[PDB]
Design a protein around this ligand. Structure first.
Ligand SMILES: CCCCCCCCCCCCCCCCCC(=O)OC[C@H](COP(=O)([O-])OCC[N+](C)(C)C)OC(=O)CCCCCCCCCCCCCCCCC
Ligand SMILES: CCCCCCCCCCCCCCCCCC(=O)OC[C@H](COP(=O)([O-])OCC[N+](C)(C)C)OC(=O)CCCCCCCCCCCCCCCCC
Ligand SMILES: CCCCCCCCCCCCCCCCCC(=O)OC[C@H](COP(=O)(O)OCCN)OC(=O)CCCCCCCCCCCCCCCCC
Ligand SMILES: CCCCCCCCCCCCCCCCCC(=O)OC[C@H](COP(=O)(O)OCCN)OC(=O)CCCCCCCCCCCCCCCCC
Ligand code: SF4
Ligand code: SF4
Ligand code: SF4
Lengths: 185, 176, 43, 156, 318, 115
């Protein structure tokens, strides 16, 4: 695209979380199949998810801004979390029992092979497995959401909005603040 | 000048008391209601077989709007804007200018069919019988913007339904 | 002139009062029928 | 080959079974509700076409917006539409639900119900006649017949 | 070859349930000056098929505030209770000959209420709880009078076996010596099956849809065929009790066709009752079976205890 | 043995239709579809509040009358006895005691609902 459109604006989001996402919903739906397996307990990968509304505002501002022509932005969230405590915060928001267990890398690929033979939309696949356990790289040389006038909103103000539908009747009316927030790096 | 509905005291006679006891025990009026419904089962149902049959209508019917022409090709509207001033819902927008031969005609004549209350004031305020409310009523659309008629759509409706609107006006015009 | 009018003698009669048939037998007939059926069934 | 034939037959089957079993919910607001229940009268009798009322939103298929949608009514209409299970269809009746009608410039009237719910068929009139509403229902049935959902799934 | 017998019992009853929905919609059309479904097929013979296919491709919609275990368990219990209801019914040979079949119907009638109660309770709704408590009140209204009517009728039969009810009225119909018991039995089964004028549970006017106001398609269809199987077998139960037919052991098809015609006429009368009367209150029904039916039933039970002693007409228990 | 086969056949017929009604169609589940239905508006309080019942006395006497008719069901077999007069007297006396209890509740306004 860059070589065929020299004036194209390329936007590179990290990971989107929202009401109809497949990032927090995937973690909140994995609880059906057991106890949320991870690779090396999920404490070797770092994620910085970004809210969907902020990505939309950045896209709109990049449409309006004349200086965004030819740029290559990197839309990332305001905080970096390890995968283990990110899944822990997701399950603590959903008020679900959290019992993680390790899984080897070769064992997880065979699990992703089994789920991706479905003729409908697969629940998970090996590509989703490798992208879930991939550390989000840092690119300081690229402009971000702050250069387009969009203030990044953290996951703590929208995670309940995303994951309230995954709670049972007992914990449906719990408030904002009665969940210990995640630990950053 | 008035009547006493439901002031009928009962009769204390023992024969009628026994008759009322028999009605209570054996449910006379309940079987009466059953018999009325059973007799209503064996009638011709009033269902007309739509779309192969249509309900009755009158020549004064108010349906879809149309723009008529004189019997020479010239359109009847003269941009007098009486319809847009008498319209209770402000559904008519008219813009006018003299055309190439100096005749007072319109350049824009829009009727918003989603604002129109179908009261037929425009068809009776027109001094030349240009705008009419034809007999068409099966014109439901799948989109909101398909119900926003401009001058071309109204003229097409007039050319489509002239063979009927002319006869309906011929049948009705002596009452107006 | 031509107009909608009633006829010279007016229209015909139109009913407006309650007309319920008040059918059925007497209560004694119903009780006798029931007792007869009961005794026949018993025998 | 054979898979396209099979999914076309399955699409035809489910389209017939969905279009011949439309259950609208008992929902009216105004004059147009009286005209809708006049369509449900023995003269026209929409029960012939498999169209029978079901009061609960959970057991209904098509929502008929008949009447004026005011500002106090819009959250209730939106909530009732959300509680209706997929697939769901919306039919707009009268000028009030189409574009506000007589009360377009009113301070407390939503200018058309399409600002709240996705509308499939717009039935014009004030009130649209019972034949017009039956025509709109038959148009919705013919629209349902032209759905190629399993064909789209097989092609994607 | 018992599984073939079970399948050939359980499939035609639900086919007849679907066609009873068809016939009920047609009769409920034709009494009210209009027609039934006659557009989908030839005289509307394909309407139950379209309804059944439609209800199984719609969204399941389990609520978030509802306890999911009882929410799924209740329609399964309703359909299974309606399906095992039919087992000891002699047409003229029952699937399972039982010494005490009448008490089995009574116990399963007690059990089938719990599907309504738990479907009302599990779905976290106020209207559902209202419908559940109305079902509770309806059951405590009707059950005593139902059991004592059936007790005072079976005293002339000699045993609780349903096949003996064919032999015990091979001379004359049992509707003759127990015509008042027949009328109160018919009213009691009208109240049992939650049909008009004693609906009071799936009220579309006092409530919106009753205990299944949150149940979307599929699970709701289970309650629909459970209720229609209930009304068909309850008319069949009444036909066996009071309208026994001529039975030839060499040609059972005569009894089958006679019994089928009588039960169909009873279901036609059932839909006839449906489209004639306003619905009762749910406390006026309680004042009906207790203040009007129960004293007369106690008197009739005295009469039907003393009468076989009176006329030396004690039926055999073998 | 045949009754358990019949019950199991009915149960796996019932649970087959539910299991194919939950996995077959396409689902679009949001945090608005599964809200409780309160005629279009938000409910004012929980559905687990105490729903007070007015017919408590009728329920208690339903228990007592259910047990009275439970005692009364051996009558078709008890009519096959030799001591026929004593059986007839005890049956009549039990039913008369049932009617006496019902009449005492009727005269004391026990069947009338509270409030
Ligand atoms: C299956 C075979 C056919 C079954 C028959 C029924 C089919 C037709 C059904 C018709 C429609 C019914 C729709 C539902 C109606 C519900 C309401 C209802 O019925 O309420 C019951 C009504 C209630 O009446 P009510 O509601 O008016 O009560 C008034 C109450 N107060 C006064 C307090 C306000 O009737 C009864 O309770 C009577 C029950 C039957 C009595 C039978 C008596 C038989 C004869 C005895 C002897 C008489 C002679 C005298 C003594 C001689 C002694 C030797
Ligand atoms: C008792 C009466 C009922 C008996 C049981 C039911 C009888 C009919 C069974 C077949 C029904 C039709 C197929 C299943 C239902 C499909 C519903 C639907 O909308 O599917 C869309 C979906 C496709 O939707 P999609 O993939 O476009 O995604 C829609 C969702 N978004 C856009 C948000 C991502 O169809 C399928 O998934 C295919 C289902 C199976 C098709 C046939 C396979 C071979 C069968 C031999
Ligand atoms: C590998 C090989 C097999 C491949 C898979 C496919 C197998 C077959 C699938 C079922 C049948 C598919 C075809 C469905 C009909 C297609 C033609 C059609 O749409 O005809 C339309 C016509 C009605 O026309 P209409 O537009 O409604 O007219 C208005 C009235 N003037 O319609 C009619 O006149 C009537 C249409 C009737 C449709 C068939 C009957 C109902 C379905 C029966 C089978 C499924 C259900 C089985 C039982 C389930 C449990 C109850
Ligand atoms: C979590 C919720 C619940 C989930 C599970 C639900 C399971 C199904 C529930 C519905 C069925 C309940 C059945 C309860 C017992 C019924 C007994 C019965 O039907 O008896 C009838 C019959 C009587 O026989 P008789 O008249 O003496 O004649 C034989 C002489 N030749 O008897 C016979 O003919 C005898 C036949 C063999 C009997 C074997 C013993 C009974 C087996 C019971 C199995 C377990 C039932 C569990 C029910 C749970 C209900 C909540
Ligand atoms: S019928 Fe009435 S509301 Fe409609 S355009 Fe004419 S004047 Fe306006
Ligand atoms: S009233 Fe008639 S002539 Fe006048 S502007 Fe309207 S359509 Fe034209
Ligand atoms: S469109 Fe007309 S008939 Fe319908 S509700 Fe509005 S004012 Fe009444």
């Amino acid at each position: 695209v860059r070589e065929t459109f020299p004036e194209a604006t390329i936007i590179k989001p990290a990971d989107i979380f929202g009401r109809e996402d497949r990032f927090l919903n995937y973690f909140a739906n994995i609880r059906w199949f057991g106890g949320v397996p991870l690779i090396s307990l999920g404490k070797k990968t770092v994620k910085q998810p970004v809210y969907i509304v902020d990505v939309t505002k950045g896209i709109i501002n990049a449409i309006k801004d004349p200086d965004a022509r030819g740029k290559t932005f990197a839309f990332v969230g305001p905080n970096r979390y390890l995968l283990f405590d990110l899944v822990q915060y997701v399950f603590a928001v959903a008020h679900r029992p959290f019992l993680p267990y390790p899984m080897p890398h070769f064992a997880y690929r065979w699990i992703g092979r089994l789920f991706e033979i479905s003729p409908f939309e697969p629940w998970t696949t090996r590509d989703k497995v490798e992208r879930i356990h991939t550390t989000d790289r840092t690119l300081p040389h690229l402009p971000g959401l702050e250069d387009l006038g969009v203030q990044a909103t953290p996951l703590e103000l929208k995670a309940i909005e995303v994951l309230r539908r995954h709670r049972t009747y007992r914990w449906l009316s719990s408030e904002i603040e009665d969940v210990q927030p995640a630990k950053t790096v | 000048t008035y009547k006493y509905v439901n002031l009928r005291e009962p009769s204390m006679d023992m024969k009628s008391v026994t008759d009322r006891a028999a009605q209570t025990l054996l449910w006379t009026e309940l079987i009466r209601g059953l018999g009325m419904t059973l007799s209503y089962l064996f009638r011709e149902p009033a269902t007309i077989n739509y779309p192969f049959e249509k309900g009755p209508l009158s020549p004064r019917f108010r349906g879809e709007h149309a723009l008529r022409r004189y019997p020479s090709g010239e359109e009847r509207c003269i941009a007098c804007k009486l319809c847009e001033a008498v319209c209770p819902a402000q559904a008519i927008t008219i813009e006018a200018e003299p055309r190439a031969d100096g005749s007072r005609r319109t350049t824009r004549y829009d009727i918003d069919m989603t604002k129109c209350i179908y009261c037929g004031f425009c068809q009776e305020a027109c001094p030349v019988d240009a705008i009419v409310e034809g007999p068409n009523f099966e014109f439901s659309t799948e989109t909101h913007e398909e119900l926003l008629y401009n001058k071309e759509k109204l003229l097409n409706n007039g050319d489509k339904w002239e063979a009927e609107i002319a006869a309906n006006i011929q049948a009705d015009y002596l009452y107006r | 002139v031509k107009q909608d009018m009633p006829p010279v003698g007016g229209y015909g009669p139109i009913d407006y009062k309650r007309n319920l048939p008040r059918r059925g037998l007497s209560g004694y007939s119903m009780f006798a029928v029931g007792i007869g059926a009961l005794l026949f069934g018993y025998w | 080959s054979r898979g396209e034939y099979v999914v076309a037959k399955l699409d035809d089957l489910i389209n017939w079974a969905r279009r011949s079993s439309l259950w609208p919910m008992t929902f009216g607001l105004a004059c147009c509700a009286v005209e809708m229940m006049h369509m449900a009268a023995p003269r026209y009798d929409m029960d012939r076409f498999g169209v029978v009322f079901r009061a609960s939103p959970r057991q209904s298929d098509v929502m008929i917006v008949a009447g004026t949608l005011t500002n106090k009514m819009a959250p209730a209409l939106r909530k009732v539409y959300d509680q209706m299970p997929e697939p769901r269809y919306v039919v707009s009746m009268g000028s009030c639900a189409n574009g506000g009608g007589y009360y377009h410039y009113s301070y407390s009237v939503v200018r058309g119900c399409d600002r709240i719910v996705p509308v499939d068929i717009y039935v014009p009139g004030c009130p649209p006649t019972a034949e017009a509403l039956l025509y709109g229902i038959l148009q919705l049935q013919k629209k349902i017949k032209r759905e190629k959902r399993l064909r789209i799934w097989y092609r994607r | 070859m018992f599984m073939i017998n079970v399948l050939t019992l359980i499939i035609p009853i639900l086919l007849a349930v679907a066609f009873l929905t068809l016939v009920e919609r047609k009769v409920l059309g034709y009494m009210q000056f209009r027609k039934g479904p006659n557009v989908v097929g030839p005289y509307g013979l394909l309407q139950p098929i379209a309804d059944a296919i439609k209800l199984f491709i719609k969204e399941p919609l389990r609520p978030a505030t509802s306890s999911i275990s009882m929410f799924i368990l209740a329609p399964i219990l309703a359909l299974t209770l309606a399906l095992t209801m039919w087992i000891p019914l002699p047409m003229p040979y029952p699937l399972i000959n039982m010494n005490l079949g009448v008490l089995f119907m009574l116990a399963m009638s007690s059990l089938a209420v719990y599907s309504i109660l738990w479907s009302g309770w599990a779905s976290n709704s106020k209207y559902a709880l209202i419908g559940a408590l109305r079902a509770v009140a309806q059951t405590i209204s009707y059950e005593v009078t139902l059991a004592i009517i059936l007790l005072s009728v079976l005293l002339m039969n000699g045993s609780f076996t349903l096949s003996t009810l064919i032999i015990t009225q091979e001379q004359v119909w049992l509707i003759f010596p127990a015509w008042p018991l027949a009328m109160m039995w018919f009213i009691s089964t009208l109240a049992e099956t939650n049909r008009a004028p004693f609906d009071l549970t799936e009220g579309e006017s006092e409530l919106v849809s009753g205990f299944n106001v949150e149940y979307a398609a599929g699970p709701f269809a289970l309650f629909f065929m459970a209720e229609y199987a209930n009304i068909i077998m309850m008319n069949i139960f009444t036909t066996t009790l009071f309208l026994g037919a001529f039975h030839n052991p060499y040609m059972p098809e005569l009894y089958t066709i006679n019994f089928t015609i009588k039960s169909l006429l009873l279901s036609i009368t059932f839909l006839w009752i449906r489209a004639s009367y306003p619905r009762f209150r749910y406390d006026q029904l309680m004042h009906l079976l207790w203040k009007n039916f129960l004293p007369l039933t106690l008197a009739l039970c005295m009469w039907h205890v003393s009468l076989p002693i009176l006329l030396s007409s004690i039926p055999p228990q073998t | 043995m045949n009754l358990m086969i019949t019950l199991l056949t009915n149960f796996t017929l019932a649970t087959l239709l539910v299991t194919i009604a939950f996995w077959l169609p396409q689902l679009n589940v949001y945090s608005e579809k599964t809200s409780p239905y309160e005629c279009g508006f938000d409910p004012m309080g929980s559905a687990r509040l105490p729903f007070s019942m007015k017919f408590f006395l009728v329920a208690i006497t339903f228990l007592l009358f259910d047990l009275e008719i439970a005692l009364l069901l051996p009558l078709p077999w008890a009519s096959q006895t030799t001591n026929l007069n004593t059986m007839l007297t005890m049956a009549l006396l039990l039913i008369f005691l049932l009617a006496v209890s019902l009449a005492y509740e009727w005269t004391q306004k026990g069947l009338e609902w509270t409030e």
